[PDB]
Homo-oligomer: A and B are copies of this chain.
Amino acid sequence: NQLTLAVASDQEISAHGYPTMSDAVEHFSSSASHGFKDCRFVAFGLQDIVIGVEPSDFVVALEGDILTAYIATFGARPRCLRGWLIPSNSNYVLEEFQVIF
């Protein structure tokens, strides 16, 4: 539930998603157990900073107002979408979040 995430703090970041949903639950379960030390939070309003992730690529989406995390394409647009967790090594600032998995 309580997570201190690495929020992207570069003007542009190099990132990547995954091609299929099965590669994503494979890859993101390791992240989820390692507190996402490898991912960066990108706010919905800052999506343009992300390079290397196509609309078809799977990332971790966050929705809510308390956030619910789930695997989704980067191009998907549900209401209440607040941001994504995206594999990246960008520079970051640590921020506390409340996340449901």
- Using a CB–CB distance below 8 Å, which chain A residues touch chain B? 19-22, 55-56, 58, 63-64, 68, 70-73, 75-80, 100
Contact = CB atoms under 8 A, between A and B. Distances in A.
Given A20-B80, A21-B63, A63-B21, A72 B75 contact: no
B73 A70 contact: no
A76 B75 contact: yes
A78 B56 contact: yes
Contact of A20 (B55, B63, B73, B75): B63
20 contacts: A19-B80, A20-B63, A20-B64, A20-B68, A20-B78, A20-B79, A21-B68, A21-B78, A22-B68, A22-B100, A55-B77, A56-B77, A56-B79, A58-B78, A72-B72, A73-B76, A73-B77, A73-B78, A75-B77, A76-B76
